[PDB]
Design a binder for this molecule. Sequence first.
Ligand SMILES: O=P(O)(O)OC[C@H]1O[C@H](OP(=O)(O)OP(=O)(O)O)[C@H](O)[C@@H]1O
Ligand SMILES: O=P(O)(O)OC[C@H]1O[C@H](OP(=O)(O)OP(=O)(O)O)[C@H](O)[C@@H]1O
Ligand SMILES: O=C(O)c1ccccc1O
Ligand SMILES: O=C(O)c1ccccc1O
Ligand SMILES: [Mg+2]
Ligand SMILES: [Mg+2]
Ligand SMILES: [Mg+2]
Ligand SMILES: [Mg+2]
Lengths: 346, 346
Amino acid sequence: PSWPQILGRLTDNRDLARGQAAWAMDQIMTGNARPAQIAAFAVAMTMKAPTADEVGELAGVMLSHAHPLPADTVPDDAVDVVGTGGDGVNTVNLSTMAAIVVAAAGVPVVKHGNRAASSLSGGADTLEALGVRIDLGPDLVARSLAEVGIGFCFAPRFHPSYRHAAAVRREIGVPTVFNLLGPLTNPARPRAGLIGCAFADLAEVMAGVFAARRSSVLVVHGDDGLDELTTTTTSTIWRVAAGSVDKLTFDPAGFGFARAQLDQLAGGDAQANAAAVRAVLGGARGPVRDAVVLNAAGAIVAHAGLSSRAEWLPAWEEGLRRASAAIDTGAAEQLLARWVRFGRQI
Amino acid sequence: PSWPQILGRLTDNRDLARGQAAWAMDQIMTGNARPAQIAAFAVAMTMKAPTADEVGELAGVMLSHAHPLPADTVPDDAVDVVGTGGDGVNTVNLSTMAAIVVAAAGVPVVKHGNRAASSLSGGADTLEALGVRIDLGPDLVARSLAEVGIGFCFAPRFHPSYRHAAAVRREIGVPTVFNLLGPLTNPARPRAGLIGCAFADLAEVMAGVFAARRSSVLVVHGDDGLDELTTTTTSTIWRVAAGSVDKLTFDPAGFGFARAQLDQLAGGDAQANAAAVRAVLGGARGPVRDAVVLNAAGAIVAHAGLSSRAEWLPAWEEGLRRASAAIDTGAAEQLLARWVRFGRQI
Ligand SMILES: O=P(O)(O)OC[C@H]1O[C@H](OP(=O)(O)OP(=O)(O)O)[C@H](O)[C@@H]1O
Ligand SMILES: O=P(O)(O)OC[C@H]1O[C@H](OP(=O)(O)OP(=O)(O)O)[C@H](O)[C@@H]1O
Ligand SMILES: O=C(O)c1ccccc1O
Ligand SMILES: O=C(O)c1ccccc1O
Ligand SMILES: [Mg+2]
Ligand SMILES: [Mg+2]
Ligand SMILES: [Mg+2]
Ligand SMILES: [Mg+2]
């Protein structure tokens, strides 16, 4: 294989042969690709329209190179809540808030995340401002998960060989297929997830990658453009269960949610977004809470799907009940406090 | 303007706004673009499908930055004979041989060229092997043109600010829109040419760029893949005259040319290809001579097109007669000897 061969095939608008995307990603991950080659590959793949097979190869290479968690430290039913980012709408950190609530409901959460790329504050930035340690290595993440019920895998700490690709992503500035890889490369490899996709025409490809792994996952795109389950309108959901993908339209009004305006979900810098986390966890009513509860419930539904006996509507009602109770009893607020203390106590 | 704006527009499969391609190329020509940005741009433009407006912007910027020839040193009727290269068929240097014969017939030739990229020996490599000075500056090319009837503009000598783009083209090694720019950026700006295009679906775009300049040009693509008029089969010609483009198919059998096999046109390293030039100019009959006479006649037809009185069949008959006579009288052989002497006597 070679760059001229692979890039030529993509510019001819042809799908790659089996193993070609993997070869490319591995060249990229070993410091063996020129920045120009990395860029051409990212752009060419994006414009051809990447297939699930191709994206799965990219993600697989990344997972091969990632720092893994220690054997037997990740519960079989661990869940992630994370999105591509890049929806362009500056919101509060919905996935991060949802993840805390989910953990507090008793679902183990190993969250993958990163700093902002185009937003004012990313999940990692907001966690840092809350006093949560985002610098933890494999062993300490495993301990966080066991002792607190949640662990945070900071993308740059677990994927050091992605350095070169990350740099090129920053330089070119446009979204590419690389923007899909974060949610697909959690180093703890959880089998369930609520996965947000900002790019409506690539969400089905992300869902195909999860289906290949037989994950129980909801890939979500709010019909307003959010990489989260939205409260402002319907959301498209690509449901992954039993190795197949199901596309459906989701309306939170069907569960009693009131239509919000995007303005109401608006965020700020790390300090502002941290304050919004404390506000929700302290029981504050309103649009932000509603959005947090809905997404927390979505992750609980994904967790439920790890069993083939899970039914859609009863799963959602249970998810909503559990998410609401985890906040209302103060369990979510206490969990955050316990998470902060854990990192301080080394 | 910005890289994210421009690259995003391209990845959304949209034509650029007027001036955006020019902004991009200017950034690239001023050393202000990262290699990743250069590559993303070249690739994204290629996969979107470039327009003549866009390619015309890129070439315009390059021509802005190029060393010009001194005022009033290029005859109004000078012609170029040059191709994109990249046909991936190792042939003798047909454009370069054609250019010598055309100059010997008395049509002023200011030829743009470069060393090999893909092939064993490019036009510049073969001229060097023949003893021709290939890297003369503006004043000396002007003198060569006046005194010998032909001048050669070496792309790296006249387009020094293209070095970063050139480097990226080499690194990524798949053709992009940049592969079109050589024949479109002759620094002497001759108004006529025989212009080869290896890429069947980009030839019409090249022709549109020349149309916008009101050049008299035949853009040619051999139906066997050659970026020259072939003798093995038909060629597609995009004829540019009076600011418009006419698509034609051309069959040299209509002018008495026997079919050749492509291996009959095969070349080798610069020494071999130099020997091939000497063989044709010394009156050797055979397939190489036929392909040379045909291409020289094409260039003479383009020159004739600078008049609105030019008629297609008479022009080809005159071109063929003039090209053959220039070889047979020994004028083409003598012009090469004189060109070699000129460079030695500077
Ligand atoms: O700056 P952007 O490109 O828009 O990305 C915003 C955030 O979205 C992703 O994380 P995640 O879903 O985990 O964070 P969230 O809590 O902000 O939803 C990404 O890692 C960023 O942290
Ligand atoms: O290595 P490649 O990418 O295939 O390019 C082969 C040659 O074709 C172009 O020139 P030109 O048309 O002047 O050369 P020619 O005499 O070989 O036809 C290009 O400048 C190279 O010199
Ligand atoms: O975004 C990443 O995952 C990353 C990884 C390694 C180095 C820098 C980075 O931004
Ligand atoms: O090929 C070119 O035009 C070129 C131009 C400047 C520097 C190096 C180069 O190869
Ligand atoms: Mg999110
Ligand atoms: Mg989001
Ligand atoms: Mg040529
Ligand atoms: Mg050629």
